[PDB]
Amino acid sequence: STGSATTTPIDSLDDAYITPVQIGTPAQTLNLDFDTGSSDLWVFSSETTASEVDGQTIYTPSKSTTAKLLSGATWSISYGDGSSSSGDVYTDTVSVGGLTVTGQAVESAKKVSSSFTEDSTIDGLLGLAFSTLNTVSPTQQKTFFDNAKASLDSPVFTADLGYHAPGTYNFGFIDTTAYTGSITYTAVSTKQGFWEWTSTGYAVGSGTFKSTSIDGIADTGTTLLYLPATVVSAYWAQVSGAKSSSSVGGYVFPCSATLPSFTFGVGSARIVIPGDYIDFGPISTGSSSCFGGIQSSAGIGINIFGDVALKAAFVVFNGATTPTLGFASK
């Protein structure tokens, strides 16, 4: 089997992407944030505190003939941005782009933090990291990809995110028309539960490539590219007037600037992020200070190849016995 679904930016900045997911019988379609940096499929639901729902589409398990409470199971998650959610668990039929998993754990939110409430476009998350991070207790549950893997033609999914445009998530096959050149594959460590790999270096604009190992995660659930402070400082030094602002919370730059590209290494291959991908617009409406899309990871504890980096590539998440990642230009 295979599945193919379109993923769509939630706003004009590509702050996140949403993909429609069918849950239950008859289907209830919710728009989920596919997140290769976490491992819970959770949804706004009929059980979510009413004051914490503001425009999202909710899953109502009582209206699904295939929904079953997973007796005794609860979940609770905190994300790297300070947001959180928690609730109980059903099993139900979940389909993505024509690919169906029966008995998928669907984590029903009783509580969500304010950042989720305030984002009416995201009805929940679908985690695509390794199932070792799944928060369900006392019986940890598998991700949608883990449950589907055995039935897939090939044990892979691919992320093809668009710049200011829709893209595609494919399950079970590699669309050879979706990229240029060849896919370069690189080793993955699953020791932290993430799609963790080592980039071979970087370049700023037309500058020379710096060979240096940068360990990081391929994370579709993070908007920006978070890299070591040395690398980020070298990038922003090429933009006149750019500075790190503690009050804003990162590097800002004059909105009048033309940004240079940023290149990262995948083995001997190179992925070029055009400068425009690094512009996240005015820090506040009407401001002439613009927020940068490459930021320091120094306060995180890990480097994060988020959407800014991933949208420049066709990315293969290879879930074979020994997982690997693949990157191609497109």
Beta strand 225-227 pairing with 303-305: antiparallel
Residue bearing tokens 């993923």: 7
Determine contact, residues 111/48, Cβ cutoff 8 Å. Answer: yes
Technique employed here was X-ray
Alpha carbon 291 to chain centroid distance? Answer: 20
Half-sphere exposure of 111 (CA within 13 A, CB side): 10
The dihedrals phi and psi of 66, each to the nearest 5 degrees, come to: -105, -5
Neighbours of 119 (CB within 10 A): 20
SS3 300: coil
Residue bearing tokens 């024509």: 98
175-330: CATH topology is Cathepsin D, subunit A; domain 1 (2.40.70)
Assigned token pair, 305: 């190849």
Q: What is the resolution of this structure in A?
A: 1.4
Residue bearing tokens 């037309």: 206
SS3 317: strand
Mark the breaks in the chain: residue after which each occurs, C to N over 2.5 Å: none
Assigned token pair, 72: 């005794």
Distance CA 5, CA 242 (A): 38
The residues, any chain, with a CB within 8 Å of residue 237's CB and separated by 6 or more, are: none
Determine contact, residues 149/85, Cβ cutoff 8 Å. Answer: no
Beta strand 84-96 pairing with 68-78: antiparallel
Q: Looking at the annotation, which residues are catalytic? A: 35, 199
Distance CA 260, CA 205 (A): 5
Cα angle for residues 81, 92, 120 (degrees, 5° grid)? 35
CATH 1.10.3720.10 fits 5-174, yes or no: no
Distance CA 294, CA 306 (A): 10
Distance CA 324, CA 187 (A): 5
The dihedrals phi and psi of 158, each to the nearest 5 degrees, come to: -125, 145
Q: Where in the chain is the domain with CATH 2.40.70.10?
A: 5-174, 175-330
Strand order in the sheet with 269-273: 269-273, 262-266, 196-204, 210-218, 303-305, 225-227, 294-296
Neighbours of 176 (CB within 10 A): 9
Distance CA 127, CA 123 (A): 13
Distance CA 172, CA 158 (A): 8
- What residues form DSSP beta bridges with 189? 196
